[model samples]
Target chain A: MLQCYNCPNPTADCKTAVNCSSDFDACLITKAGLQVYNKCWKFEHCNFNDVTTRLRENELTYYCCKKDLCNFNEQLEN
Target chain B: TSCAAKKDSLNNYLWDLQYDKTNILARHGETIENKFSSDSFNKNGEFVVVEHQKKNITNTTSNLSVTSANDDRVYPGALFRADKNLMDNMPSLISANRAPITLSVDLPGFHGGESAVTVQRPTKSSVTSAVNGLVSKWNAQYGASHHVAARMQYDSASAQSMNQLKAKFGADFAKIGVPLKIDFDAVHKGEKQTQIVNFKQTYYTVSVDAPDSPADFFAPCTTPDSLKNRGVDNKRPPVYVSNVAYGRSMYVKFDTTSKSTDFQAAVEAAIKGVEIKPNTEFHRILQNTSVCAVILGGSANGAAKVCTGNIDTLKALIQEGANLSTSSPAVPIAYTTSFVKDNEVATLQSNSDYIETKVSSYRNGYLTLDHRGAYVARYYIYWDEYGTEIDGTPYVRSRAWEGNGKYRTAHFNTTIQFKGNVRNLRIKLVEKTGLVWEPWRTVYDRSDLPLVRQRTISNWGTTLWPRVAETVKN
Candidate 1:
């Protein structure tokens, strides 16, 4: 049961969808600056330096899919 | 050669002290010594004091002693930390004596209209002689109409320098908890006074609540949540469902209490192996006994679900479709299914997980008689109620579809009787696809049916299902 596009807060348009729960198998999207954060990440923090320093502290830019709504990103889904 | 001080947010240091007001052993007493190993900053913001050595001087009003040859370091601010009583109780408006404190001030063509001009509050006890006597008493009373400047707002975690806080409090100074924003300008004759006067002034000093200040800029900075690089990943996820959209369709909903109808038929066969394109215009349906609804491109989708054992057979099929003397005749449901994503035609929208129910109603059309004595005009499609709250609480707050426990958008609520008013209604635009549902224009002809007027339906056959007995407290 994996599906993501959670939209934590900074949203431009985030068709909220998130199933991922049997220990979430990834599907993140973080971005930061032009806002973006869909969530469910933890396929071991899906690295690029561990989510650019603690999931979101050192500015950001991420992408970590595992499947299902593969964090849908039609160019940052609007 | 080890000196480092740029601290502040109360770690204090922003200290400077240069000399040469006509040197020559300081205008006559002979005792001019200097020895700087290095001090940066230049490109005109000048401070470059690389290697200078001039020995002691005495008369230039006698005291300019700054000794620091590294003694366990950290006094880096050259001088001013012998703790003259923590520099005279640091938070000055002067305790170095000069008294008379009232100074109200607003002076412009007198002393502030609407009252203010008490005067005298300058004790001058060092911190640059009490900020040069508070900028020479606001430049001798509004320097020809304002023009006084002073700086030092703060930001600490180290890095504060308004010229090292004017060379570390320039002169036996005294306490300073921070915040010194004084800028009074009314410059004319030299520019900048295009008429706009407020004369800004904010001066407060006394409580960084000392204990050696700086450590409470709204303090709450903690991370290392058990740190494995800031932890929280035992694998995460305990329960969360949300994923309900109607436009680009997504819906999800499942639960046989976590798997039972043979693992819910192997979780609906792995959710229909996520559609490998069998019926384009997107489709994944699994409704009712569990709910999945997943369309993604050719929009239009509908799924209602309330029937925990048929209520008197759906209230006699909503009392025979709200009987106008039971006649029954309202059909228009066309769709021959030729789909491939031009918004896969399907209509009746409302699935932001429902919460649009205030007993819903919007009649306005009028002129009856139908069942074919033919004299049309009747609009009514009233019904709105969306998900959970038959005392269960939670009428959609959107976490998308938040599943694991409860979720509902349409567990039943839909009404569309209207047997008479069907004049050029035109409603479906599931993207253009073979003109399947978009062009039928005429929304009200026949001279707009004599401007609608027949009123007298009074709740007709009634079974708007007791409008679900209202109650949704919030």
Candidate 2:
């Protein structure tokens, strides 16, 4: 039961960690620019293709951490 | 470079300035970060409002990495500063066993060795930790004891970051940051100082809501007794409020089942003592809303319409929090006030700037080429007086320099003159009041983003509106 946060977007704090999926190693976004998921996510779940319609390319990223409550530190900034 | 040999200290002025420059920068970054990261959420130190991006930046001998919660955001030491000189100096300073000087400017983002490489909070621990590891051994020696003298800088991002830092860190760092002066007597032609002390004063912010009632809330004045009190007071000055849609209808539930014809009159009669307006924008989105309904005290633009729904309970709730501004609910009843320094009234004032920024025509931005990180300066158009407007955050759009390559070498300019009101301008706000979602809480029209999205404007009217939350080192 890895307790990690979901950096779904900015403005939402998942408040508490939830049960991670059994097959998942961690949660993360491949980019950064002031927003993060607030729920449990698998390494594959982090991508901006659908996160923003803004069409950005570099220096933006989010990644997975296996820590129990990793993303909660609000480390999803660039 | 023994501490003893270094004591010979011949005109090391350049090094002196370099050392001090980094110091000033980190002091600023960390100081601001410390302030903003104040409400760190829970017991384990989770910052909810202004969380810092903590990173364990590891830099030992030949390896480095910025390990963040996001795996990819991490980068090696080579990429952190790229500037070889900065990295070289880090070890000596660390080995000196000196106070944790904030590497605000050079360390890519670490402020005073204790904060984000930048501000607005948070950092990955990898970079910080790894770097600390490198300092322990070669370059050859180094790390944190006592109060960290963290520092940094910010524009709007930096300023907002700094201000939040100041606010959260409380008064100690707030009375404006401490200036550790550097003297350049050695490396110059005849001994001199780099800059002059232009002026100084204790600064404060003045947030004034363009008020509904003229007499109740005073316009933000620099004069005496001009600004009045709020909360539980009739003016509801700080009760707080903004935009009201033009064609908004009101709803009032009389529960009468008798007269749809005279419901407005009946509702009006019931709240005879209460001031009311039904046309207010509050009624459109937020239901139990108005001067009489909630902290509105019933007298909003909506007071006149009382359209549908049973407003009787609302009237009772209105009566419930009459001094609502003083109460928790009334806190949302927006009002205006100036933050004058303690004992400092509306007089000569304190650390404020009457600036003269080089003006610009602000056109051709799309045509300008990248400054190659060399020298790039741009303008942001902001309605100057928005500071005193409703929920009035500064309305500015910082120009992005995605240059047009063709006319890359030219410049443009604009003359200066400014103003105070748009009265009916349809703006957007995040309903920080908590009853609903805080997504751009826009009505009729809305926008907070640094860069605008491509073709962002729609027939539906979408755009970005940055809130003014930071200022400069006035």
TM-score of each: 0.16, 0.20
Q: Residues B1-474, candidate 1, lDDT per residue (tens digit)?
A: 432222232121111112121221111122223432323223222122222223221111111111111111111011112122111212111111122222222223334322222223322232223323333455455556643221111111101222222222222211211212211121111111111101111121110011122211112232212211221122210000001001111122232211111222223223224432334212222222232222112212222233121223322332332311211111111101100111121111110111100111122333321111111112222222245574557463222111211211212122223223233321111111123244322211122222222321211111111111111111
Tell me the spans in candidate 2 whose CA falls farther than 4 Å from its real position: A7-10, A29-35, A44-63, B1-474
Q: Give the TM-score of candidate 1.
A: 0.16
* Predicted complex 1: CAPRI docking category: incorrect
List the candidate 1 regions with Cα displacement exceeding 4 Å: A1-78, B1-79, B82-134, B141-471
DockQ of 2: 0.01
Worst 10 residues of 2 chain B by lDDT: B196-205
Residue-wise C-alpha lDDT for candidate 2, range B246-326, written one tens digit per residue: 011111222221101222222332333222234532122223322211111223333333323344454454443332121
> Considering only chain A, what is the TM-score of each predicted structure?
0.35, 0.51
A2-75 per-residue lDDT for model 1 (tens digits): 65567667664455665778887878776665667777878787777887776455666667767555554332
